[PDB]
Amino acid sequence: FSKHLKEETIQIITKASHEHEDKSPETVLQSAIKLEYARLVKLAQEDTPPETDYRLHHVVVYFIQNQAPKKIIEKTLLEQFGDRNLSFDERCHNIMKVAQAKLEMIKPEEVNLEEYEEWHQDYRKFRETTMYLIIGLENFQRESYIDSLLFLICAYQNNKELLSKGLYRGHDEELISHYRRECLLKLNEQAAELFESGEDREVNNGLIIMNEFIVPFLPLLLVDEMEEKDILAVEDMRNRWCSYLGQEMEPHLQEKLTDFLPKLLDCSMEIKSFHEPPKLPSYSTHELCERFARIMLSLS
Ligand code: NA
């Protein structure tokens, strides 16, 4: 469904046609599927730099690395060669009709439809998780920590869920953990700087950060005693806000602090924030790959 994929599909069909004297669409389609699978296996096998992730380029690379059933990969490839955008060109039109014909013949014994859809839903979630991560890091790099946090929280949770299904399902946990934690710490420091400002408008914004973002999401860093850097980060944030009470405070500011400080100190009763995830924009595969590369090359 892309210029790159449509042209890659036509190119592989033409290369397939040269493999046998018989040029029937049934013969060519079988050779084209074998050639395309081999092309995607090569991508799946490649050791790539951090800015490139061939799982983002094609669902079948994700399926290979995650050891999806062969018949599920085969049906996915048949759907590629049966796509209506192959319908105009003389080289691919009759192959496309043969692929559409074979898709109808597959029996539920060969491909369970719910299993097929589950695999494609995993890949959809992997792409969504990647975009949450991209936007989270793009905002982090711009020092826009509120937008960064909400997207990184979603990337982190999605990713843990994906990786519960298998090792090749998701993204580097250390990377997302680091930026989720650093984002909370930076946003907390921004809140404290505003709280100290002595300008009522800036103080109010610091308090919005604490009441709307830091206190509600603090439990996320406490869910796992094994995540020691997360636990240490929470203690550092709690220490920062208690330190104001080590000397006399102006009474109005003290009241605003102790309005939220008990909930910062013990968030065990409100582990779920019920906050809605931010919405993702629409995106192409090319855009997903380009933006992933760009943020990986811009890490700070
Ligand atoms: Na890579």
Side-chain angles (χ1 to χ4, degrees), residues 2 4-5 8-10 12-70 72-83 85-89 91 93-103 106 108 110-198 200 202-224 226-278 280-299:
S2 84
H4 185 73
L5 184 51
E8 195 85 45
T9 303
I10 298 187
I12 203 94
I13 278 164
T14 298
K15 179 165 171 170
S17 74
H18 302 149
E19 299 234 290
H20 308 97
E21 161 146 22
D22 176 18
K23 318 290 183 178
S24 68
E26 301 82 3
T27 298
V28 179
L29 173 61
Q30 173 182 336
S31 301
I33 282 153
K34 160 183 214 55
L35 285 184
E36 178 72 352
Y37 182 64
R39 174 182 86 79
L40 298 169
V41 163
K42 181 169 190 165
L43 295 184
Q45 291 284 333
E46 181 77 20
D47 285 316
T48 52
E51 79 265 6
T52 296
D53 182 348
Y54 283 132
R55 299 174 298 169
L56 300 175
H57 293 235
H58 198 292
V59 58
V60 166
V61 173
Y62 191 80
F63 286 175
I64 291 156
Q65 292 192 347
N66 284 284
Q67 293 291 279
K70 297 265 176 307
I72 293 285
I73 296 171
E74 189 176 35
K75 176 171 167 194
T76 301
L77 289 175
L78 280 165
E79 299 247 57
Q80 180 177 322
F81 288 98
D83 171 36
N85 312 158
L86 297 172
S87 181
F88 302 89
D89 196 283
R91 307 169 269 182
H93 176 86
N94 282 340
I95 283 150
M96 172 199 75
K97 312 278 298 304
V98 172
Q100 289 165 358
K102 313 239 154 153
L103 287 161
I106 301 175
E110 319 153 54
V111 174
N112 180 281
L113 308 152
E114 273 202 298
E115 189 176 2
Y116 185 79
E117 292 304 322
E118 281 164 357
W119 273 100
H120 277 279
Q121 178 42 238
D122 280 3
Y123 186 60
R124 251 174 249 122
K125 185 171 184 174
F126 170 74
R127 290 168 65 96
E128 291 162 352
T129 304
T130 306
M131 187 56 66
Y132 281 129
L133 178 59
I134 287 165
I135 295 167
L137 296 174
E138 283 168 350
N139 281 288
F140 186 91
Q141 285 304 278
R142 288 192 291 263
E143 301 186 350
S144 182
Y145 297 119
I146 287 177
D147 285 320
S148 174
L149 180 61
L150 308 184
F151 284 88
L152 289 174
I153 280 163
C154 291
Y156 183 109
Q157 186 50 39
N158 274 21
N159 193 53
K160 291 292 195 183
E161 289 164 1
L162 281 170
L163 291 174
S164 81
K165 305 184 151 204
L167 276 181
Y168 284 91
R169 288 288 204 294
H171 284 294
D172 164 29
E173 283 161 288
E174 155 71 38
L175 175 92
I176 308 179
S177 176
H178 170 84
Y179 282 100
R180 184 184 72 160
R181 178 173 57 251
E182 287 293 305
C183 195
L184 265 171
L185 285 163
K186 292 268 124 187
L187 184 62
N188 189 72
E189 295 166 33
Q190 180 183 1
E193 290 173 26
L194 289 163
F195 178 84
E196 288 165 10
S197 69
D200 277 10
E202 308 214 272
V203 173
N204 158 71
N205 283 345
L207 297 165
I208 281 166
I209 294 172
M210 293 310 298
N211 285 289
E212 295 200 6
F213 298 110
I214 304 297
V215 173
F217 289 129
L218 202 71
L220 299 178
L221 267 56
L222 297 171
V223 295
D224 192 349
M226 292 328 288
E227 296 286 335
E228 290 183 84
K229 292 167 169 275
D230 279 354
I231 297 185
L232 163 57
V234 166
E235 181 60 20
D236 283 350
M237 288 178 263
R238 292 175 164 163
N239 281 340
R240 177 76 159 90
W241 286 101
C242 291
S243 71
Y244 297 111
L245 291 164
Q247 54 189 54
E248 179 189 354
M249 286 182 75
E250 190 276 315
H252 295 135
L253 197 69
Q254 180 164 349
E255 186 176 302
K256 293 158 181 186
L257 174 63
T258 65
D259 280 344
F260 75 84
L261 193 49
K263 293 176 295 196
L264 186 80
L265 291 174
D266 179 1
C267 47
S268 70
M269 300 289 88
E270 299 188 277
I271 291 164
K272 307 173 179 170
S273 69
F274 306 105
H275 290 204
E276 301 229 354
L280 290 177
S282 200
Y283 53 90
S284 64
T285 292
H286 187 283
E287 185 184 348
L288 180 68
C289 291
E290 164 169 4
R291 288 173 73 175
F292 186 80
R294 180 168 179 171
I295 198 56
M296 288 306 295
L297 291 174
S298 309
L299 261 43

